[model samples]
Structures are given as C-alpha cells and as structure tokens.
Target: KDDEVIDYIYGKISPLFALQYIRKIDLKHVFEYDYHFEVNGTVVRHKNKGFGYMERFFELKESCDERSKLSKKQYERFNALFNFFEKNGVICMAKDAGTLNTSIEINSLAYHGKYDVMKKFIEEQSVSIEDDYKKAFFLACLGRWEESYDLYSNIILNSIDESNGCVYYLSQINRYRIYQSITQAVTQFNGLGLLTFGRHYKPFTDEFLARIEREMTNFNIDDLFNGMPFEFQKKYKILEFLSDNQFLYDDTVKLFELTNKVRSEMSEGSYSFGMSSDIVVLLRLYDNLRFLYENCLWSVSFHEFHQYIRNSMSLLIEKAEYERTRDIDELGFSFFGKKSGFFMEYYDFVNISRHFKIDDIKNLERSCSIDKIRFGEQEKIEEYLVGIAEEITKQFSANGMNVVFYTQFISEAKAALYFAKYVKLSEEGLGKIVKALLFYFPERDLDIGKRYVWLERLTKCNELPKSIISIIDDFLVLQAEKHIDQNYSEVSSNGLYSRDYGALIKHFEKNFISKRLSEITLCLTQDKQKQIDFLFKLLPLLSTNAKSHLLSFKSVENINDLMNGIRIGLIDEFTPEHEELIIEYLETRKVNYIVEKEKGIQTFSSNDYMSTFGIWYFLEEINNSKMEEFIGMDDQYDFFVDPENFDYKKFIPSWLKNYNDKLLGKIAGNKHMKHHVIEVLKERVKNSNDKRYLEILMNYFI
Candidate 1:
C-alpha cells in the first residue's frame, strides 16, 4: 500500500488509475503525514481509504485557505497546489473555494473569460479595499472604465481640503498611484484610443491642472528655483523657469543682484553646486543683459548701465585678484592646483558690451573708473592691466573700437608702467599697447621724455625688444644734435656740463660704450679749445680704445688745457695703448722736453711723473732753454718782472731759473746731495776726468 500511494503521488500511476484510487483513499493522510506520524489517528485515517482521501482533500483546502498568513514553506506548498489545479484547468473553481480568493478570483475572472463578473466584484469591493489605486487598477484591467476613473479621481480630490492643510499630503499621494492612473488614462485617450476608463476625463484633468497652476502662480519662482536641490533642478528645469519669468526682465537690477550674490558665494567656495552650474547661472544672467540691451536700452539710462559696468568690473577684478592670490598661496606642499577658469569667466563676462558701437565704448570709457584699479606688486598689476587690455581689445576685435580710445581713461605714465612690467612681448595685446604709445600721439617734449623713461625702464629690466632699440637710438641721435650748439661759456656758466653732457655720456656709456668717442666727436664743435675742454671733462669716463679715440681728436693750444687733459685721463688708469697714444701725441708736437723711449723700459723719472699725474702722464716738463736766455739777459728778466708787460711764458721761465739756482745751492749745502755729486764726479774723472769736463758739469749745477 505504501508503494502504491508513493507511485500515485509521484505520477508514476496513470491519471485515470490515480483518480480512481484518490476517490477511494483519504489523500489527506498521505498529504498531512509528517516525520512523527506513528500515531493511532494516522493509522485509523489510513485504515479507511475513502476517509484518507477526504482528509487529504480537506488538508489541501485548509492550507490554501491560510495562504495569506502562511509561513514560507507553507505558502510555497499552497502555491504549488494552485499551480497544479490551474494546469489541470480547474483553477477558477479552486480559487473560488479558497480563502486566498480576492486577488486570485479577480485575476482568474479577468484572465479566464469572466470579465463581467470581475468588473462587478471590483466595483462592489472597491469601497472597502484600502489601496484604492490597486482597486482602480483592477477595474481598469477588467474594462470597467467608469468605475476605475471615478475611484482614481475621487481619491486624488479627496486627499486635498479647502484649507490647504491636506494639500501637502495630497501632493505627496498625487504622484503615488492616483496621479499615475490619471496620466495613463490621458495618455491612452490622446493616442488613437477612446477614454475607456471614464466617459470624460477633463474635469479630473481640470482639477489637477488647476492645482498645479495655483501652486506655480502663488510660488516665488526665484525662491522656489533657487532653493531647489541642484539635482532636482536638473530634472525640473528650474533654471529655465527662472530665466523665462517676467520678473527677470521687469526688475533687471534684482536679477543681476541675485547673480552677483551667486557669483560671490561661488568665489568664496561657499556654494557646492559646481563650476559648471555657476557658468550656467552666469550665462543666463548674460542673456538677461542682452535682453535689456536690446529691448530696454532707451528705458534704462546710460548712467545706470555705467554704474552696473563699473560695479561688475570691480567685482570681477576683485575675484581675479583673489584667485591669483589663492593660486600663488597653493604652490607648496599639500598644494593641489590652481583655478584659472573663474578669472577667465569673469573676464569674458565683463568684456560683454551692451552696445557693439564705438559710442558705447566711449561712454563706458568716460564713465568707468579705472583709476582705483591698482595692485601691490609689479607682476600682479601687470597681469591685471594685461587682462584689462585683452578684454578691451577682445571686444574691439569683434567690433571697431580703438584700444587707444579706451586707454585714454588711464594716464600715459600708467600705461607705460604696465607695458614695462609686462614679462612677455609675445602677446598681441601688449604689442598693440606699445604700438599705440609709439604712433598714436604727436611728438612733444614731455611725450618724448615719457618714451625715453619707458625705454630706460625696459632697458634696465632687460625687457627691451630689438625692435624698440632702433627707435630709442634714433631719438638719442636727434637729441644729441639739438645739444651740439651749447658752447663752453654757456656750459660752464649754466653748470650744464654734467646736466647736459652727463646724460648723453651715461646714455652712450651704458648702451654703446664703443661708439661713445665717435658719437661725442661727431657731436662736439670743431674749435680746438672746445674739443680739448670737452675731452678733458669726458675722457676720464671712457676706457681703452674709446679713450684713445677721444684723445686723437685733441689739439693742444696752451700747456694748461693739455695738462688738464693729461690729468683727467690719468685718473682712469689708462691702458698701455692709451698711454702710448698720449705720449706719442705729446712728443710729435715737440712742445715739451725729455723722453725715455725704450721698449719695456720706463724711466724712474717717468714713474715719478705718472704717479703725480695719471698713468697717461709723459716724462716731460716745460723746456728750460728759454729760461736760460731770460736769466742771462738781466734787462729781459727786468721786462718779465713788470706785471703789465709780463708774458707768462717768459715770466714763468725766469721765476723757475731763480728758484732752481737757489735749490742747487740748498742741495749742495745738503750732505747727501754733495756726497752724490762728488761720487758722480769721481766716477767721471776716473774714466776721463779732464778739467774741461769737470768745469762743464760744474756749470750745469751752478
């Protein structure tokens, strides 16, 4: 009997045979049998086959009845039985008799050719069903359109109240099922289908539409859109809504005010949205500006626009400065990187002109305050001016604005300062600025002075380009020509020697030291004394070939000018070549005495003279031959003694001879000079000490 029952349960028995056996046996006993089923009741139930079959049937019924509350294993078992009944084509009858009946019954009637019954039951029980959406969903599934529509619409409307207390809860549920049902109906109805769920859906639609319109109209769009979570804004197009609102155009100032706050917050790193979001906000703000410029330009006075531009430029420059500082501060350990986009964005934004015409640029130039724009460091101010110049030119390149017209707002000195501090000459904007400085203005003394100072700064900083050097060179040449007419009397009387000559000297000295002598010779007058005078003042400042070249132009008249030139040249520690040139010039003229002209042999006397003068001093003094004549003729000496008739040449020679005779007597009186003289005389006499030679040497001393 156990084998037979097992075979029947396992489907090894034929279905006809299995049913015949199930009809006689109590199947419940087999089905309900557990591991511990060794009891009398199980034995008694198994003893009567028909009671066992009945008991098995009742057990299946009871399990399926408790399906809703069944444990996991129990629910699976009941589900298997239900599946089996459905496979055998008796699921409808089985579900009807089971306690797992409502959804199962609805599913069966709706799926298995009992639509009318399904609709009736859904409608009748819809009032008591807690999930009204679920009830309405089934009614619609059963082709009961009117009932489904009424249920969804009623629930949606009922969730709200007149006092708006329930409106929040209503809105929450509106998205859950009621709203989804209505939207589905509307979608289906609009797309080649009739409204199967309801006779009319517009009243519910009107109610839904009215509620949305009321909320949106009463809402502060700015507050609503701004307060939204960024992620939500992406989904709802909140930025689009804010941009399209009439209030943005009506109160344009407030629109910009909001944008400024957003920009400020973003700069401070207070907003966490993202740079892209900030860009979007800025783009929308720029759109508003474009709108104002197009439609309301006449309504908005130029003053208001001017003020806006000033404020905007200030804010942007401030932001750029902050970002630059932040970048510089972050260049060490634990430093991440720089942020350059914020500054560039602000730059582009400020460059946006309301009008593209030159008049607008002129108005902005006149009204915008750039004087307060200053930076603490050279590079930062340079970078700031560079940005300003770039932005201004950027707008101009798009239009016809002149860069100089815009630069007129700032002084020429400031412009030059910026240009000098600029590190790179590669930028086209900087080139434009320099070009404007060079060609835009008429030449004047002050302007030329400014250009010179500018060039000087550029030179000092080593930033001068080769292109500018020629311009400065030409200017210097022209200036030198103008200075050539100045005479010695004028130069000395006005103390213009250093002031006039030193400037040219320094310029040539720093820039073209090799050309200094040639340039000076070209600029000086042809007068010999003037040339000597100028050379005396300028020769000490030169070197090597330049000093040689300067001295080659000298034409000595009096010993005083020649001596002065020698004195000045000596101070410089002239080169051997320079010293030779001076000595050769002195000797070829035969204007003085004494020469020691051996190669590599400098006389002690020359050394003594060089030490007293400079290295350029020659071993020569005034020829004393004329002094002997003045000393031998007593009347000639008496003539030199008269102040009115005194010739300095003759008077100086006579005075020197008298002093020399007194000095010889004093030296002969000295024990050392007398001993040196006696030793030299003894050596000469030892060689050929004739009395005539002794008398001749004695005459030279006496």
Candidate 2:
C-alpha cells in the first residue's frame, strides 16, 4: 500500500510537489518508497526535481528521530540540498543562519525575526552554552539591549578573533550599531527631533561611549571602512563617526599638507568603494585648492602664493596634458578638433583661472614687456597666463608688435602666429622686421611672392638648412618635369618654373649637389626615369663627380629607345653593364613576342622592331654559333614515323594561314630546318588539339 501510494503521488505530481507535500504533512515514511530515496537515500533525483527539493528533503529528514545525530552523509546531503535550494530559489535560507546551527531553533528564530521564539530559545540555550557574540547580535536585533551590551563588551575586551570567520566582524559591526543608537539618543533632543516623528530612542551611557572611542582607535580608518560586512558598512557611517569624535581632522590636514605625495601614491593604487584613486586624489586637490583660495590667499606672501599656485597648476596641467597627449597619440589630432575655444571653459572648472587672467594685456605688458624681463624672468610672466596661451591666442586679436613682443619673450612666436594671424602690418619698418623674422614662421598659407621674399632673405642671411634647399629643389624638379616636352625657351618663359628654376639650380650647385646626387642614386632602383631625364639635360653643367651618379640610374625605357640612343651616339661612354642589360631586355621581349605569335595572339606589328632589329642583328653576329643551336634537331624526331608524333597534318589549315609564301619558301629551302619545324608543329598539334594551329600550318604551305 505504501508503494502504491508513493507511485500514485510520484506519477501525478512533480518530485518538487511530492517532496513539499511530504515535508508539510510530516510524511517521511512515504518518501522512503520513492525511487530516489530507495536508491540513494535522497528524496529528490538530480534531473527531475524542481525548485526547493533540497530544502524539502532536508526538512523531511530533520523531522525524523535522529536529526541531531545526522551522519556525515546526511550532513553533506543537507548542505548540498540547501545550496541547490538557495541557488534555484526553491527555499531561501534565512540571513541569520549565515553562521551555523549552534542552536538551530534559536538561529532559525533569529533569522526570521521571530524574537519571542528567539528569546525563549536563547534563554533555554544560555544555561548550557555561555553567551556568544552571534547570539548577542540577535539580542541587539531583538531589542534586548541589556544582554546584547554585555556580550558585545566582552567580545571587544577580548579582541575580535576574525579567524573564526565573519562572526567576529559581525559582532564588531553590531557594536557600532549600539554606539549609533546611543549617540543618536544623546543628540535626539535637538531641533531636528521634529523631523524624527517621535520614534523610541535609547538612553546614552558614558561607559558605552568611552568603550567605542577606545575600540575605534585600534582600527585603521581604511580597515574600519572596508573590512566590515557590506550591509553594516553601508548602514553605519564609520568615517563620519570618526570625524564627529574629532579623530580624523589632524590626519586630514596632514594628508592635505602632503597632497602631492598622497596624489602620487593614490594614483598608482586601484579604486575601491565605487570611486577610482585618480578621482579621489583629484577631489582632494580641488578641496585643498578651494581651501587655499578662500581662506589663505591673502594671508600668504606673493612669493609664497606664486610657489604654491605654480605647484598646484603644474599638477593640474600634468594630469590634463597626460590625458590629452595620450588621446592625441592614440586617436589622432582630430579628436580635439575645435576644442581650442573651450580651453577657458575647462579652466573655469579647475577654478584657478578665476584668479589668473591672460587677457589682462595691460598688466602683462607692464610686468612682462621684453625689455623689462630678460629670458630668465620669462617664467614669471607665463605664471600669469596659467598655461592658457593657446586659448588666449584664439580669443584675442593679433597686434603685430604686441604679439611678436609677447611671443618673443616666451620663445614661441612661430607657434603663436600659426594659431593666430598677425594683422595690420603694412608699414615699411614692420615689413623689414617681419622679413627678417620670416624663418621663424611656418609656411602654412604664405603666397608665392612671400615665399620668394622669404627665400631671398634666407639666402642673403645664409641661414637655410640643406634639407630646406632640397625641398625647394624637389619642387622645382616636379615643375620642370611637368613641361618637359616644351622648348627650353618656352618653358623658361612660364612664371611657375622660370624664376625659381634658376635660383633652385644655383642653390642646388652651391649647397645641395652632393646630397642630391646621393639621393638620386638611392632612388635608382625604383621609378626615377623622369628625374634621370632632368639630370641628363643638366649633364653638361654637372661636374665629373656629379655625372658619375647619373650612370647608375636604372633605365625605365624599353630596349628600342635605349638602342636608338646607343646607335645615334647620344650615350657617350656607356658602361658594359648597360650593354648587358639591353641584351637581356631584348631577349625577354623577343621570347614573349614569339610565344604570343605561336598562340595566334598577333602581338607585334611589322614596324614594332624597326629600331630594336639593329641591336638584335648585332647580338646575332656576336653569338652566331650559339644562335644556330636554337633550331638544331633533337633525337625526339626519331619517332616521327609513329602516327602519334606526325600529327602535323591535323593542323595544316592553321599552319598554312600563319606562314605566308615568302616565309614558307625560306623554311622549305632548308631541308634539315624544314623537317625539324614539321616535327615541332606536329608535337604542338598533338598536345593542344587546337584548330588555331591548323590555320597557322596551312598559311605556311600556301
């Protein structure tokens, strides 16, 4: 009947439902017949059970006689069951059971906040078991302060034993709760009481406050904040308590005194409690800066203020510049596009710019004029700008003299002008001065006339670097190449290259010839054909040393053009290597042309080799013996009588169309060459079986 009942229930309901029914109805005897129970002594199987099966199983087992004397197997079964239940939401273990079942009923009662059961249970257990801190936290939660205070005080006096687990830390946390309650009672009578709605408050005790103060002294601030259980850490404001007791102010000021050192240390550490160390140090620096700005600005001397503000500004700029430079290097300059105008807006957030202003030009001119301030004193003037020069350039109008004067003092006149243009400079005196300083400015938007003026001025002063002259000459070479097909007189009349070419060539000869020749030699392996032609035109003007560099220039021309030049005696003293290169070039072209012709691609015209044939004739005369072997018969023709080797008759149509009367007569006149050609054609026809070969063969016979 038990089997019948168990099978009926198991088939009708899920294992979870059956297990819950058995647990609720105190039916452990019925579970003994279930398949899982009979097989493994567990009420639920691994696969079929639903949520809370483990909890139901444990509850069913606990209801039996030997619950307290549960064997090791039974203990593991209980834990595994509970873990499964907790994870899958079958049954949630009460929070207070986080420690253990020192007194199972008492702990369970404490977890669910059933203080009456808890009180009765702990009272019964207390006679056999001395007061433990876990029970003490329960007592505090149950509003049994008389017993709670005694246990917490005993734990604190003996020093917390964290090795036992979070139970020790849990007691310390509730200790703060008692302190919090007492402190609130003492201060509850203030005007803020109207906001409290008359909640019941505990009375304060002197001994309790004294004990808490001494206990807190033993804890490091960071440990007190972090080492507490997360729930209690959130509930009690430990740092606030330290501040209220006047324990943290000395440390805070000392930390503020060593702000940079603290910042350096904090910057390298990882973040915790939801904020990064960089953010923490940044907020700390801002607070210190605010403190000085509001309270100590007037109290400090000018030199003292200068030094302090310099250090603070340097720190701020160091952080901003580090982030800015990193982003620019990684993401490119476009990331900060148009951000120059917002520099002052960002500076306003830093709060330093309120006290320092770069737009105060009158004051800056008076204190930082070039004549009054030497180069050594320039930093004193920049101190007034607060690292806002880029922003100031965007915001202020440019007066030539003032901009030049201010920039000259800082040694960044060219940089300043690049960002902001100098206006109203038509005066002759100003022109002369600007021309003299032309080398200091970049060539971003200068016109051709201005470029010429700058070039002439720089040449007169002899201040141009060879790299700069090379850049100018490269530009001229490009221009000359553009008009290469024109007459020299016509090309020289064009304003683009006519004027600059003369000056560029003269500059090249005087300053850049050796460097230019070396550069040309290096570029010879690639496409420098156009540069070679330009240099060839200037060959008469070049010294012998310069002309030698031209000999190594790799020719990009085809064989016909080079051969024509060689035949016409245009190339004087050509190297043997040049002649050898020409031979290889012509050989490759001839081989490709012959291969394409055999494939009936019609690759060449009659006049295509007009100039190259002279070179070909020369090669044939020199190597006539080696040339004859190209058409020499081989032993493969011994099998010509075999039908497989004499397949030339199949391609007679293509052969007849390809070779005309004159060519066919020449081949037929040589008895040995004729037979070899016939064998070669037969092999090609047998291999390819292409009808195109028939027309080529037929043309020869016709």
Candidate 3:
C-alpha cells in the first residue's frame, strides 16, 4: 500500500524523476498541537486534542513490553513511525546552517551530500516549466544524463512559445562539448589529410575537400543536433530558414568555395606564403558556419559571430607569419616597411583577437626581423627590417601625400624620433623603440601629421643612405657641442671658470671628444711640432676677458676674484661682434678642452692655484714687457707638482674648498660626465699604479 501510494505520487507529478523520494506525515502534531481547518468558509476545530486521537488510532491492547512482540505487519508500521521521528530529529538538530540563503545553501549542500534534501524539496514544490528544467538540471548534475535529457526535452517542449534563453543555454553547452571533442579528434587525425591529398593530387589535389569529407562524415557529431528540443533546434535553424529568402547562404557557399582557390594560390610555393594559408583554412571553416546559418532551414543571423571569427583568424595568421618568418634574413629593407603598411591596413585588427581568446602580442614576440646578425657587428649584411614609418604613411596618405595631417602628433612623434636618433639605434631594436614612442598615441582618431613624420624618418629614408648617415653624425656633433656650452655657461655664472683647467678637461672627457682626439693622436705620424700644432688648435679658445681673469689670479683663492671680473666683463657694454666672438671662442675652447683633458676632470687645489695662475701671469708680463723674463718653465713644474708636498699651505684660502665642491658637483651631476670619468678612472687605474686618483675619482664621480 505504501509503495502504491509513492508510485501514485510519482506518476501524478512526472514519472521521469532520476532521483527517488518518499513522504510521510507525523500524527504527533494532530494530537499535541492546535489545529483548525476551513472548508467552504466554515472553520472547524478537532476536539479531544492531547493523546485522545493518538490513543484511538493506536488502540494499544497490551503494555509497552508487549509492543516489541507485535506481528510482522504491525512491527513494520511501528518501525516506520519511529524511523520518521528519528530522521526529523536529525534534520532539526543537524550541524550549523549559518545564515546562508536557499540558493547558496543548495549549492553548498550539493557538494556536501545534503543536495538530496534540497532536490526532494524542490521537486515536491515546483510545477512550472522552469521548475522542470531545474529538476532536469539537477538530475544532470547527479550524472543521470538519460533521465535529465528526457526531462529537459519535456521542459523545452512545454515552453515552445518562449525558448530564446533556453535555446541559448543549450547552444552554449553544445558549443563547449563540440570544441572539446573536435579539438581532440583533430589532434588525433594529425596531418593525415595532407599526406593523403598529396598522394592523390598531382600537387594539385584538393586537400581541404578530402579533409572535409573524411572528417565531417566520420565525426559522430553532437547528439544535441538530433535530440535537443524543437524550439532549441529552431533557434539554430531560423537563420537557415530565412537564408532562403535572402540568398545569404548561397553567397556564403560561393565564398567558401572561393577560399579554396585562395588557399591553393597562397600555398603554391611561388610566394612567401608563411601562415597565410592558415587564414584561408580558417576563412573556409568560418564560412561553412555562415552558410549553415543563412541557407539551412534552421539557420539564424549570426553575422556578428562570423565577423568575430574572421577578425581573430586574421590576427592569428599575422602572428604566425610574424613569429616564424619575420627574420631579417628572410625579408628586405622594404619588408619592415610593408609590415608597417599591413598594420595600417588592418588597424581595426588590434584587440579584435580578444573576441576569440587570442593572446596579446608581448614585447619579445610582437615584432621581429627576417634577418639574423651577430653581436658586435656593425653592418647588417642581410637587410630585413620593418619600420613604423610605412604604417604611418599608409594610415594618413589619403592621396598618398607626403605631408603630415596633424600638428600635435607631429610634435610628439618628432620628439620620439629625435630621442631615438640621439639615444642610439641597434639592428632589431627600432621596433621596441617605436612601440614605446607610439604607446601613448591614441588608437582611435589619431593625429595623422605625427604619423607621417614618423613614417618619413623611420621608413622613407633610403637604406644605408650616405646622406642620412651624415645627418646622424652631424646631429651627434651638435649635441656634444651644445652640452659643452651649457656646462660652460653654468660654471661661468658661478664665477669659477678662470684657471679651472681640470673642470674644462673633464667636460671634454665626458663628451667622448677626448677619446676621439686620442684616436687621432695615435694615428698621427708627424713629429712633435705637428702634435703641438694639433694640441694648440685642439685646446679651448679662452676669451681675452677669461685670459685676463686667469692672469689676475695670485693664488688658488683668487678664484672668487676671477669669477667677479669675468661676470663684470660679460655684462659690460661692448660691440655685438666682440660679444659674439667671445661666446664662440668659449665654445671652441670647450670643444678642444674636451679633447685635451682625456684622463680625468682637472683638480684645482689651493696650493697649486698660484702656480697655475703664475703661468698666465708671466705670459701677460712677457707680452707687456712688464717683467724682464718669462716664468713658463718654473710655472709648469710648480703647477704640476702635488699640492700635498707644497709649502704654499699658508697661502691657501678656505674659499677654494667651496669652489672645488661646486665644480665637482657640476661635473658629476651629468650622466655623460660621470660615465666618461669612471671609464677614464678605470683606464688610469688599470695602466698606472695610481690608487689615490682612483679613490678620489670614484668618490667624486659616483
């Protein structure tokens, strides 16, 4: 009778339940608790409340001891009642339920073995189509696939009028399964199609056709295709059904067929196809789906989806080509330019890969050269380069005009190019440099002027062009001279440029002019006279005022006096030509000074200042006939001697220390100056046993 009751309940609701449930009521509530029943608007209360009905129902004829010895049917009934009470007790006092809601608790319980309770409760209460779907979903979760499918079919069939969401969910699940299975199958198939096609076709055999037939026919496609709910089927078929009205499917089929020709041509071995053939394959496959959606009786408008596939496949093809065939050895000067051009043509392709789960091109993999070269090699024999310039040209040249269309971008792009050129360039390094340069440039509605400028500078220039190379050299020279002028102006303003030959020498070393001059010196085959001539011409062109300032120095402490005089002379009213000449001479002097002071920044100490000034002092005396003899020889020895052993300590002034610190800071503050100084110090330490200069140099330079 109990089995019959359970079966009757199950059949009344839906016989497709994968999980079983049984229900019973407790009589304790009827007797122990207040009860009221309303029938036809008349309320009635059952009397003889506590234990009366229970006693009447049980009809115990013997004592509690005799209850254990009841007949089999009676024992079964009594055991069922006790078991029901025990189960309810366990449910009431189970572990902490916390404050979790139904959904969260259901999910938690599903993992923790309490899902059965939630499942039974939902089944007992639910009646709508969604309820049925939920029931089926639960069955599916429990691994009762066949039962789930049956219930799922019923739910979908009942909701035929409104099945969009249901259809979408089904399709999504189907797609997941399709991908997993198809990918695995394809991997197992390997390149069997290619090998088979090669054997059949005379280099003209249809590889793709053979593959489609073999793979598609034997694939054992998804069961969802045949057994999913009709409404669900209609969602997919809708586009195909409508395609008959618009001929969209017909067009797509033609396009797919055309893709075969494209693929064959790309793979014909005449061109450097690289991964382009893969694009054709992707296009055909995508078109197949498009065709189904448009021409088939059950297709739908998946235009957006197909577009995403095309864009992503384009990127993958481009990436594969870039990764495998982008070596400089495989390309030409124009290849990099063409790459830039391709990016321009496919500007919208950026970030489109995200639609298909493609990885972004990272720094190491993004750009590449077709040629390979060795380290320390200057000339790139095999020239394969890609330039951003070509991309810019393709982007902005509406009529292929050479002019940049925007001013703001022009400024920024010009700044980038100038920095790149001034900083330096190595083969295969331009891509990153250019990327960083353009990183901040907005992708949408970008200014065209700057793009054009970048294009010209980076791509339009002739490969290994003599004129361009010359311009680069000139730019470097100008920068060096400009830096020297800047340093001179700073020191001069500080009133410390008179006999600070050490500082002037450091300026030269920092600029690398000293090294350049040293190379020239080593190459000179002439005698000492010619070398003197060269050194004289190479030295700084000290202005008359500067010369006078140095000659006025009576001691190292006279530095302050010299600065004061120079400042006065600089501001004094003089001919424009004279002032200009003086500035020019200072620059020239700085240049030559850079050449002469190759070892380290000059050190002007209090003890030796007088001796240094004494040289200029005697030169002036000899010129003016104020002194009978010149002190050149004595001055040189005195100035060159170590200040520590000199007896001129009493003549030294404390102000020199401040002056020294300022000059040292100026020299050390510059990156170029510090670099050159360190190198010079290393060279000196390596060649000579001069630890004192090395220690002092390191402290000051660093």
Compare the candidates by lDDT and give the number of the best one. Answer: 2
lDDT of each: 0.38, 0.39, 0.35
How close is every model to the real structure, measured as TM-score?
Answer: 0.26, 0.18, 0.18
State the lDDT of candidate 1 residue by residue for 1-702, as single tens digits. 222222333342122221201211122223443211211112122233342233343355445443444556545554554455443222222212332211101112221223335446665644532346445545544334345546655555654432222222222322333334444555645553333333433423457645644433434333544543454434323123332224334335654765577566646654232233333334333433443332111112224444454445444444444444443333332344434333222223223332123334334334433223332234433444454444344444465532222222233234333334323344444454444443433332124545444445444433445445344434334344444444523222212332233344355446444254445655554464455455455554434554665556664444445455454434334445444454454343222222323323333333233323321111223222323222222223333222233332332222223334434454455554455454555565568655544553566554
Candidate 3 C-alpha error for residue 590, in Å: 43
Candidate 3: Cα lDDT at 127: 70
User: What stretches of model 3 exceed 4 Å from their correct place?
Assistant: 1-159, 162-222, 229-269, 272-279, 285-360, 363-702
Q: All predictions: root-mean-square deviation over Cα?
A: 38.0, 34.3, 31.0
Tell me the tens digit of each residue's lDDT in model 2 across 134-176.
Answer: 4665565544454566777776654443332233443455565
Q: Which regions in candidate 1 have their CA more than 4 angstroms from the true location?
A: 1-269, 274-307, 324-423, 426-462, 465-467, 484-511, 514-517, 526-702
Would you list the rank order by TM-score, best first?
1, 2, 3
Predicted structure 2, TM vs. truth: 0.18
- Clash totals for all candidate models: 13, 21, 29
Question: With candidate 3 superimposed using the best TM-score fit, by how many Å does residue 176's alpha carbon deviate from the native?
Answer: 8.7
lDDT of 3 by residue, 539-569 (tens): 3332343233333322112234333334333
lDDT of 3 at 44: 28
